[PDB]
Amino acid sequence: ASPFRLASAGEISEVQGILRTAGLLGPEKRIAYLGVLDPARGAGSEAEDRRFRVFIHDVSGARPQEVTVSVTNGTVISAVELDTAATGELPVLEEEFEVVEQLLATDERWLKALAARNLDVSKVRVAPLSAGVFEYAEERGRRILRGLAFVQDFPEDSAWAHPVDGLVAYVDVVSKEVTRVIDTGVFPVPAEHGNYTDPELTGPLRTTQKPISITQPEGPSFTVTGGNHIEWEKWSLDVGFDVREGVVLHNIAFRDGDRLRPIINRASIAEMVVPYGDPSPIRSWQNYFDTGEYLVGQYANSLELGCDCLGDITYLSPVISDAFGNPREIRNGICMHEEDWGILAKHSDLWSGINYTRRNRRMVISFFTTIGNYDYGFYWYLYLDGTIEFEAKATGVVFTSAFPEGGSDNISQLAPGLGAPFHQHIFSARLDMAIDGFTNRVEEEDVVRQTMGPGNERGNAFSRKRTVLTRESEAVREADARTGRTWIISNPESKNRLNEPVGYKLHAHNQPTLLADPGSSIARRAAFATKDLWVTRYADDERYPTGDFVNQHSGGAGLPSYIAQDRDIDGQDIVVWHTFGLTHFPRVEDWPIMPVDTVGFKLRPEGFFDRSPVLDVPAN
Amino acid sequence: ASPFRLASAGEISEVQGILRTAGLLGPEKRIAYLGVLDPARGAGSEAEDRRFRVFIHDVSGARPQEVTVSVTNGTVISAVELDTAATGELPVLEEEFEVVEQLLATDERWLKALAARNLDVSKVRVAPLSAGVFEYAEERGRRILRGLAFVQDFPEDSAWAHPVDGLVAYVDVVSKEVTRVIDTGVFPVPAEHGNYTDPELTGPLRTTQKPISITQPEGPSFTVTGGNHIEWEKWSLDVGFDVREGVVLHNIAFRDGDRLRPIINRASIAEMVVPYGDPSPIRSWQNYFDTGEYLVGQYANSLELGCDCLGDITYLSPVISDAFGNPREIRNGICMHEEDWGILAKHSDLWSGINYTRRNRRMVISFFTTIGNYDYGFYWYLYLDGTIEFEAKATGVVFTSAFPEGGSDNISQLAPGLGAPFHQHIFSARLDMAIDGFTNRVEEEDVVRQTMGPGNERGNAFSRKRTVLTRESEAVREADARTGRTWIISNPESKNRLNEPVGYKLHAHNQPTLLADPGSSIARRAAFATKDLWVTRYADDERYPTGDFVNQHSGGAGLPSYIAQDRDIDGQDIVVWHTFGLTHFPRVEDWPIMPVDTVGFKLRPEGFFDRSPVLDVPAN
Ligand SMILES: [Cu+2]
Ligand SMILES: [Cu+2]
Ligand code: NA
Ligand code: NA
């Protein structure tokens, strides 16, 4: 059995049984996170030990625990009681989504605010929102959620159309108390609906779209073995799934002749945060760590054939744990298919008379998740020519507010009285590199402009310079789009046939990084988001750029603390963390449901191969 | 008949007849460029006048002419004798491609250089390369080409594998004289072949690719009427074709309810240049204006069904003129099809219970051209949601040199002894804007970071600032990727239902612009390439950023001279010129034939619509 196989239902049940037998999973306990751990370096031969890590919440007020179990051996490896005021609260539990609204519905201050606005409490939905860390001392060590109100005129109404501005509440979800209700003033509740399946708003549906049929009459060119091992057009990898990160790729390698050459040991989106830029106190605290606080894998959609995934689709249905340790399958949660990708290479040569055209293809591994109003697709692509790409597709319904009478520098108007606060969606890709194996380094490569003069008399020359990042203290880097800045991951001990180090070049989109003031809470809690590229020395406990417990965790842990170790990264087992985000000034076209917009990055081979790796692609 | 229809064979013949009857097209004359002119502003009602512009070369040494004819009326509108030392030489003629090699084959200096290197003259191919303007006074007013030598070991060999470095020659293609032969020293001629259809180099061809079938059982959702008028998913446009620019898009508009709203009046790639960054005198003069010097439309490939264009394809076969004024069809030179484009919009709403998914599509209009060693695909995309995108796909065989013994700061190694000089491929997109009609302006929009303090106590706020470009003197702009800089084209007299000006936002890729020293010849001749964005007032004679006659034209004309008029662009008929390029440090994977790499830009509606324009898209 591959140590990188997906968790099975039975493994989850065994975790549940081990915890129960150990006294760690009584009736007051709730699992907030559960996932398999990756194999240790050098374990491959042989003795598998499948370990699972668990964060256990306690609804009676006792301290939560972090536990690692061996499902192979039926044992508890470690169990530690957590002090959440110090190391952070556990991820938000799905069962807490409804608690915020329920507690507020009987609170006299909340009821007073709603009555002043002539809103029926039974129609008022409350978004259960992560709290962060601000000035409220009573929240330290307590599990808090904040609530913003949205009116549903009827049960199938889009409540996002009807934000209740001027009002926010804070709730202790363990003691089941409402800590604060803040009402700064009434705002009109926007009147128009945003019901994008209502014929009155859509108009007559188009009849002009003729069908498109994508089929594979001999089936797909990729095979799946061992549950999640992919072989496709010389690529080899394993598709993992973690309730926090979502789809994870392991052991990305390329068969070059008859050697299996590693490229990336683990690829994931290790954090994704949505900071808001509206200074109103109703929302200025708002920063949604979709990955670290809510767990994006947990909310993966079941993807329907034809509608969500077009073509010849192979599905994985990953297993996660519910809050009690029972396995739950996410049916059709991962889509895998191969797609045509236009022209790969083409040349019509006058002198030889030979005309040559070849087509490209990509392997696609994706999932789609829903976090409140947001919906995101996470796509990994592998191309015939060795390129690796990630793309996020952001859609859903924009988070709304009132639109202030005199306008706003921090909010867009979408409809009469309806606003959408400015925000960013910022991702961290954690790429545990293995370029031709684990001995790797990173160089920053800039274009170099040259002055007209001796040695360059016509002023045409230009060049490039590479700077080796030798230690972690030197490996916090920013974009420089103007100088074409990229980062090359190479293996200094593996040379191609031209005696040059094999490598892969990371091409970033160079979008803005975190805009918040450097002194803000979010700049400290999401320090990773302030820089485009970080390199660390591999360490099995350094998994997320924000640390293990992001919820209400005050700042510092994660990448800035890892980097302080100032470890050697010059020909060592290293990890690249790439920050990339979308800055979203909402547009009217984003309302009532937003068209997809994208952000991502790609890596291309750079002297990894001895010549083009796609010379053996056939015509047709 | 639409005044924007493609030229017909008969129209070309009529130009030929008008010129002949006027005394302008005798036996010594050769047509270097011929194309229809666009209709004048306000002509639409009615009286069509189809005019064609012609550049006429004279092989006997007489001065060339620029002529405009009316094929409607059978008349010569204007005919002007050109002074090429002042205003530039005419575009390279296809018949001159072979002349450089032929003249050199009997030149004793060339023969001496080849004999020193033991090369058989019959095997030596000579790339016919544009000359530019450097220190050689005798070239002023003469039609010069420069030649670089490549060995073909046999007739179906790839000569690019065997550059002859240290050697360059200059030729007067009218007087049929060799002006200079420069031999700076022998370099080994690289020995390996680059024959990408040789089984010895490809290895056994893959058998792993299973078929992909893309079909449309009811045909495509777009119609073509009037030869080149497209209607597709609310878009309306006309597809033009010009021998210089290639595919051109006219009258891009969107049917919003029952109004046809204009967006872009004319879209084209109005220049594309390839500057080289190797300071060796063998190549330091090298700058290939594929569009302005060679005419990319002229060399458009015939695109084969299945191999070049996959799916349900509708072809246009544009007509151009040969050197004598006879019409010539480029069979299957333009591909049109619609393609699935993944998820358009999706949201799974907990509170309403409604799960909603819709798919996107794009209309694709493309051609592929071959310029010596280079092959480029030009793609225009129209999406359901109003987005417009351009993409260039660069492939072919890299231009080679020797790889110097001690290495090189300006050349990559590809194979033993084989180099590829650093270079850029830099495009200019000329977008004659018509956002809701012709009264337009441009704003530069930057993200604005805000300081923590009063009014922003938590340091989370961020904003945006828009700067109106009021006159052409203010409208030469550079990228600022770090501040998320974009440019919005709006109609200040057309408001959406929220009382905000309708607009489209240009999203650039923010790649490096021209790297050459500002004092270089190429910085002067390709001044457009030094800045990302220019805005001019529309003028029917301001067609190319480099001017009308680029070949051996010394500098200044084009955009820097247009801009000096300092015309009002604040709510006027304006033209956006976007510079965007690929900076190419060749990689071993680019050899022997290069995988496609891409560059481009896109424009998205920004308050153009009153809400999402794709609410009427049906499921499935
Ligand atoms: Cu957003
Ligand atoms: Cu190139
Ligand atoms: Na590593
Ligand atoms: Na215009």
Residue numbers in the entry:
A (entry chain X), B (entry chain X): 9 to 628
Question: Can I see the authors' text?
Answer:
Copper amine oxidases (CAOs) occur widely in biological species ranging from bacteria to plants and animals, and catalyse the oxidative deamination of various primary amines to produce the corresponding aldehydes, hydrogen peroxide and ammonia. The CAO family commonly has a homodimeric subunit structure with a prosthetic Cu2+ ion and a protein-derived quinone cofactor, topaquinone (2,4,5-trihydroxyphenylalanine quinone; TPQ), in the active site of each subunit. The organic redox cofactor TPQ is post-translationally synthesized from a specific tyrosine residue encoded in the polypeptide chain of all CAOs. After single-turnover biogenesis of TPQ, the mature enzyme can then catalyse the multi-turnover amine-oxidation reaction.
Recently, we succeeded in obtaining a neutron diffraction data set from a CAO crystal derived from Arthrobacter globiformis (AGAO) at a resolution of 1.72 Å, which is unprecedentedly high for a protein containing over 400 residues. Moreover, we performed joint refinement using moderate-resolution X-ray data (1.72 Å) to evaluate the significance of using high-resolution X-ray diffraction data. In the active-site structure determined by neutron analysis, the cofactor TPQ and the prosthetic copper ion coordinated by three His residues (His431, His433 and His592) and two water molecules in distorted pyramidal geometry were located at essentially the same positions as those found in the X-ray/neutron analysis. The previous joint-refined structure revealed that TPQ adopts an equilibrium state between the keto and enolate forms, based on the nonplanar model of the quinone ring obtained from the atomic resolution X-ray diffraction data and on the shape of the SLD map at the C3 position of TPQ [Figs. 2(a) and 2(b)]. However, even if the low completeness is overcome, joint refinement with high-resolution X-ray data provides more accurate heavy-atom coordinates, which in turn could improve the SLD for H/D atoms.
